[PDB]
Amino acid sequence: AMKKLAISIGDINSIGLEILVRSHEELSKICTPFYFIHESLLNKALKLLNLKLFNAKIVAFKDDKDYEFNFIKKENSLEIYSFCLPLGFKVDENFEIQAGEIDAKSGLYGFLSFKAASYFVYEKHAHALLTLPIHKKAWEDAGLKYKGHTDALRDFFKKNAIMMLGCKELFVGLFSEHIPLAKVSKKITFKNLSIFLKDFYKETHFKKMGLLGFNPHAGDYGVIGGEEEKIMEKAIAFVNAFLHSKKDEKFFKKALKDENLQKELLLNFKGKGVYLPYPLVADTAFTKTGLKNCNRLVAMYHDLALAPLKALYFDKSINVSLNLPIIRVSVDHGTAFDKAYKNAKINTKSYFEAAKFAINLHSK
Amino acid sequence: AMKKLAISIGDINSIGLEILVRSHEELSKICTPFYFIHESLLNKALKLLNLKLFNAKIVAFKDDKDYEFNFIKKENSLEIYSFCLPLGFKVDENFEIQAGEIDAKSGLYGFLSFKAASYFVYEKHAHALLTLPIHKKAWEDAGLKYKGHTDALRDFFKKNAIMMLGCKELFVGLFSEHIPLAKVSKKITFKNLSIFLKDFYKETHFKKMGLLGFNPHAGDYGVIGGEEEKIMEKAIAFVNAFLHSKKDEKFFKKALKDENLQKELLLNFKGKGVYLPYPLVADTAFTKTGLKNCNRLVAMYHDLALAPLKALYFDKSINVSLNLPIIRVSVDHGTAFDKAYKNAKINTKSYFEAAKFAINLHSK
Ligand code: NI
Ligand code: NI
């Protein structure tokens, strides 16, 4: 029944640790969590929060040339493990907590917690990775070249993750993420969109998915631009027909370049496909009746997803990195970074959602 | 105590009539509706709907050189009036209703109903205008040159309407509407945005408004584009200052062209203005707490407004045309156009809200 969940602690100067601790008792009832944190630091946060922690497994990570994972000892109802791995940085746990502040020390430490946990999951010691949020500016101050988890995951695993946001009532894949909105149009090409729609299906197996119009009213039958939507349509038909045919990546790469071959594929395609054939109008897409028609969406750009999504599911909304060799989930900071260790009230709903999501998937 | 409310019937072949008729008893309790429809066509609708209509005021309208507004007879508890005016086309009520169909004759009729109702309001015979939806394609087939209400209202009154969607919980002004999204960026200029925000304020008097970022995360301090946001800031700072100064239109046109004049205004009228100084992040803007912070917003593009607002306020959300010599409101098509006169369930909640909003306004 119990799957091992690897949890990287994020920036210790934020509300990450509080979430972790307050949630521990309920979380241990649904999976076995391993927390990537050394005891000395764990205790600094505990004392500062004035909370206690029972029956938890923590993993002290260290830089070594080889992989090695061992149970070491029990202590204060605490189970301590070590994981040695090639990190490329010397772990330094001896610094103080500085509530809500940007700091090179805790920056590097959290980057390392995450790197250690990611490879822990990659080596199959746990079933999935959950990352608590980090502050990119402390990474920057630590002299790291990465811009966030995704960038680091691309470097570790050489794959470009697909982001999917939301929860059971509504998930949305993002064709593009943190790029300026004036750049998104030229990125919507037949080649790129086809690869994305193929990978997104393979990664999720959703049975009925819909693309959101890029233009108002999905272009309104060509009167409000509509050029992007023609491309979307062409990509849907071709992906639909290709998934139905059960042919391989080699055929795909070849057919992406040959219209006559795409055409042959479309003429032989005798199914309803997995993607709706025509882009959705955003006006209708996030209403109750819209959501009942389709609740697995693909958005060409960041805000089309975020605005409606956070208006409905502020609490339970998770971030899911698809297309990597590990299952990785996350949550959004949500509050102000700087406003932490102050008994400010906290929402642990999304932490639980993200966990249950990962637990529910099949082994990679 | 009641104000007079002109109501144009939209496309008689759609659900407009039924809304009008199902709503009349309850509406007459808050205002005095004047419906713009000839008797013989009203009856064809009543019959086809199989409903009756009690103590309702209807205004037949006619092409003519002069503006004249007359009472004529009472009938089936049905006060019939005359309104003659320079319409441009010969009115023609002699046509049969075609349930849910595009037709030149109900299209042309519906345009004429609206033109009459609009001038009725301008010539002060009523307080406000409420337009029931039309179908742009029936307008096209009738040979009209206009693409919609706003298009025509610009021609009637030589003013560019500013559009505002929502309800008392949330209003969004639209800096652009049905233009291709790839084209929105170039349209965000200091000149155009300042005029917009000046007119938006003058028209609404809202004491606290926010602009929503164009780029994800409001450009994240210049890391995700940010160019558009610099321009927002520059406009916000200038308009705010102009509005405190109490200076006039002539000055404003002069100060738009001259950086030093702008600096002088900014030095003299520093201070919190009616616009928040920084664009808002769309992630946070539509949540409980966000809305509690600010609930009067301005969006740079159509879908940023439509998608979260229809997720929250599907039933109650209205359309308001600001910046015209008359008050004019409207609602969006509930159902598909196709499904009129079927006995499908019909939502009247926004019709009421729209009327409620107009009454609750001062005269013009
Ligand atoms: Ni984001
Ligand atoms: Ni629209």
Q: Please, what is the angle between helix A16-27 and helix A39-49, to 10°? A: 90
* Closest CA of chain A from B201, distance in Å: 24
Task: Give the β-pairing of A328-330 and A318-322.
Answer: antiparallel
**Most distant CA atoms of chain A, gap in Å:** 69
Q: How far apart are CA A237 and CA A335, in angstroms?
A: 42
Q: How far apart are CA A11 and CA A133, in angstroms?
A: 7
Element containing residue B75 per DSSP (H, E): none
Q: Which residue has the tokens 């008994």?
A: A343
Tokens of A363: 């082994």
DSSP3 helix / strand / coil % (chain A, rounded to 5): 40, 20, 40
Residue A80's SS3 state is: strand
Q: Which ligand is nearest to the CA of A219?
A: 2
User: Looking at this protein, which amino acid is placed at residue A210?
Assistant: G
A115 is annotated as contributing to ligand binding? no
* Contact (CB, 8 A) for A169 and A338: no
Residue B25's SS3 state is: helix
Element containing residue B340 per DSSP (H, E): none
Q: CB distance A182–B178 less than 8 Å?
A: no
A149 is annotated as contributing to ligand binding? yes
Query: Of the candidates A355, A287, A358, which has an alpha carbon nearest to the alpha carbon of residue A27?
Result: A355
* Contact (CB, 8 A) for A33 and A24: yes
Please tell me the total count of domains within chain A: 1
CA torsion sign, B45 to B49 to B52 to B58? negative
Q: Which residue has the tokens 């229809």?
A: B310
DSSP designation for A76: S
* Helices assigned H by DSSP within chain A: 16-27, 39-49, 104-122, 136-141, 149-157, 184-187, 190-204, 227-245, 249-255, 259-267, 282-285, 288-293, 302-312, 349-360
* Contact (CB, 8 A) for B286 and A310: yes
Q: Which residue has the tokens 């005029």?
A: B195
Q: Please, what is the angle between helix A16-27 and helix A349-360, to 10°? A: 60
Tokens of B20: 């009008």
Query: Of the candidates A102, A128, A103, A120, which has an alpha carbon nearest to the alpha carbon of residue A60?
Result: A120
Quick check: A308 contacting B, CB < 8 Å?
yes
Q: Which residue has the tokens 């045309």?
A: B321
Residue of B nearest to A282 (CA): B307
The answer for residues whose C-beta is within 8 angstroms of residue A147's C-beta and 6 or more apart is A136, A139
* Contact (CB, 8 A) for A167 and A354: no
CA distance between the termini of chain A: 17
* Contact (CB, 8 A) for A210 and A275: yes
* Contact (CB, 8 A) for B246 and B202: no
B328 is annotated as contributing to ligand binding? yes
CA of A221 from ligand 1 middle (Å) equals 31
Please report residues of B whose CB lies closer than 8 A to that of A182.
182, 184-185, 225, 228
Quickly count: other Cβ atoms within 10 Å of residue B277's Cβ.
13
Residue of A nearest to B285 (CA): A307
C-alpha radius of gyration, chain A, whole number: 22
| Long-range contacts of B19-24, Cβ-Cβ distance < 8 Å, separation of 24 or more | B19/B132, B19/B346, B19/B348, B19/B351, B20/B132, B21/B45, B21/B46, B21/B49, B21/B51, B21/B53, B22/B51, B22/B346, B22/B348, B23/B348, B23/B351, B23/B352, B24/B53, B24/B54, B24/B56
C-alpha radius of gyration, chain B, whole number: 22
Tokens of B360: 């609750």
User: Looking at this protein, which amino acid is placed at residue A4?
Assistant: K
Determination method here?
A: X-ray
Q: How far apart are CA B160 and CA B320, in angstroms?
A: 13
* Contact (CB, 8 A) for A82 and A70: yes
* Contact (CB, 8 A) for A318 and B232: no
Q: How far apart are CA A241 and CA A262, in angstroms?
A: 9
DSSP3 helix / strand / coil % (chain B, rounded to 5): 40, 20, 40
Task: Give the β-pairing of A210-211 and A162-167.
Answer: unpaired
Tokens of A314: 């502020």
Tokens of A103: 């700091």
* Contact (CB, 8 A) for B127 and B3: yes
Q: How far apart are CA B53 and CA B109, in angstroms?
A: 21
Residue of A nearest to B336 (CA): A284
Element containing residue B342 per DSSP (H, E): none
CA of B163 from ligand 2 middle (Å) equals 10
Element containing residue B329 per DSSP (H, E): strand B328-330
Tokens of B341: 């006169």
Task: Give the β-pairing of A56-63 and B162-167.
Answer: unpaired
Quick check: B25 contacting A, CB < 8 Å?
no
Q: How far apart are CA B281 and CA B249, in angstroms?
A: 32
CA distance between the termini of chain B: 18
Query: Of the candidates A34, A38, A52, which has an alpha carbon nearest to the alpha carbon of residue A125?
Result: A34
* Closest CA of chain A from B267, distance in Å: 32
DSSP designation for B185: G
* DSSP calls for B268-286: HT-S--SB-SSPBPHHHHT
Q: Please name every residue paired with B212 in a beta bridge, in sequence order, or none if there are none.
A: B280
Of the CA atoms within 13 Å of residue A276, those in its CB half-sphere come to 18
Length of chain B: 364
Q: Please name every residue paired with B285 in a beta bridge, in sequence order, or none if there are none.
A: none
Report the phi/psi class of residue A66: left, alpha or beta, with left for phi > 0 and alpha for psi in -120 to 50: beta
Q: How far apart are CA B163 and CA A32, in angstroms?
A: 54
A17-to-A110, A113, A343, B231 alpha-carbon distances in Å:
11, 13, 12, 39
CA torsion sign, B222 to B228 to B234 to B238? negative
DSSP designation for B283: H
Query: Of the candidates B313, B247, B235, B315, which has an alpha carbon nearest to the alpha carbon of residue B275?
Result: B235
Query: Of the candidates B144, B145, B140, B113, which has an alpha carbon nearest to the alpha carbon of residue B129?
Result: B113
CATH number at residue A170: 3.40.718.10
Quickly count: other Cβ atoms within 10 Å of residue A234's Cβ.
16
DSSP designation for B150: H
Tokens of B56: 């309702």
Q: How far apart are CA B330 and CA B315, in angstroms?
A: 13
In the sheet with A328-330, reading across from the earlier edge strand, the strands are A68-74, A78-85, A56-63, A32-36, A4-8, A128-131, A328-330, A318-322, A162-167, A170-174, A296-299, A210-211
The answer for residues whose C-beta is within 8 angstroms of residue B82's C-beta and 6 or more apart is B59, B60, B61, B62, B68, B69, B70, B71, B72
Tokens of A122: 């990659």
* Closest CA of chain B from A300, distance in Å: 11
Q: Which residue has the tokens 């071709």?
A: A238
Query: Of the candidates A327, A357, A292, which has an alpha carbon nearest to the alpha carbon of residue A128?
Result: A327
Query: Of the candidates B33, B14, B37, which has an alpha carbon nearest to the alpha carbon of residue B25?
Result: B33
Length of chain A: 364
| Domain range enclosing B280 | 1-364
Residue B337's SS3 state is: coil
* Contact (CB, 8 A) for A110 and A77: no
Residue A58's SS3 state is: strand
Distance of CA A212 to the CA centre of its chain: 21
Q: Please name every residue paired with A35 in a beta bridge, in sequence order, or none if there are none.
A: A7, A58
Report the phi/psi class of residue B102: left, alpha or beta, with left for phi > 0 and alpha for psi in -120 to 50: beta
Distance of CA B117 to the CA centre of its chain: 14
* Contact (CB, 8 A) for B17 and B48: no
* Contact (CB, 8 A) for B275 and B210: yes
**E-state strands within B221-302:** 296-299
* Contact (CB, 8 A) for B209 and B276: yes
Q: How many helices (H) and strands (E) does chain B have?
A: 13, 12
